[PDB]
Amino acid sequence: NKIIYFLCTGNSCRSQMAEGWAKQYLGDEWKVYSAGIEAHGLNPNAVKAMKEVGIDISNQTSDIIDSDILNNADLVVTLCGDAADKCPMTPPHVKREHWGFDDPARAQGTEEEKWAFFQRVRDEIGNRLKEFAETGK
Predict the structure, then answer these.
(1) Among 94, 76, 95, 101, which Cα is nearest to 86's?
(2) Fewest CB within 10 angstroms: 20, 90, 112, 123, which?
(3) CA 79/CA 72 separation, integer angstroms
């Protein structure tokens, strides 16, 4: 009935966590997809971070953007400014929404700070999906 397509620079961290949160918050009415401009596989830290909150994204695949799917979506949600810049032209009926989350994989710091960063971005994405689930954004 409804299709939501998450897009980010890659399909390893943010986009995979968004897919996981969306499948939890949205009911059996929404088809959820996530992809990246490039796809280099699931980030282990992202998988662990989601597991910590009871969500298993270990079976999710790392996919490159597919216009056949994107063009049929009710809305595409870019997860950072770079993704917004690189998101291809879509049919006028597809809503283009832009959210923004820091890349936990590029964080510099102590190992404890970096792990905390993954957990923080995970929580920010979840709370944003909660807003979408309630308001339709």
Answers:
(1) 76
(2) 112
(3) 19
1-137 fold: Rossmann fold (3.40.50)
Q: For residue 60, give Cα distances in angstroms to 56, 96, 103, 108, 116.
A: 9, 23, 19, 27, 23
DSSP string, the chain: -EEEEEEESSSSSHHHHHHHHHHHHS-TTEEEEEEESS-----HHHHHHHHHTT---TT----B--HHHHTT-SEEEE-SHHHHHHPPP--TTSEEEE-----TTS--S-HHHHHHHHHHHHHHHHHHHHHHHHH--
What burial letters (b/e) apply to 71-80, b meaning 16+ CB within 10 Å?
eebebbbbbb
End-to-end Cα separation, the chain, in angstroms? 17
Method: X-ray
- Residue for token digits 């399909």? 11
The residues carrying an active-site annotation are 8, 80, 87
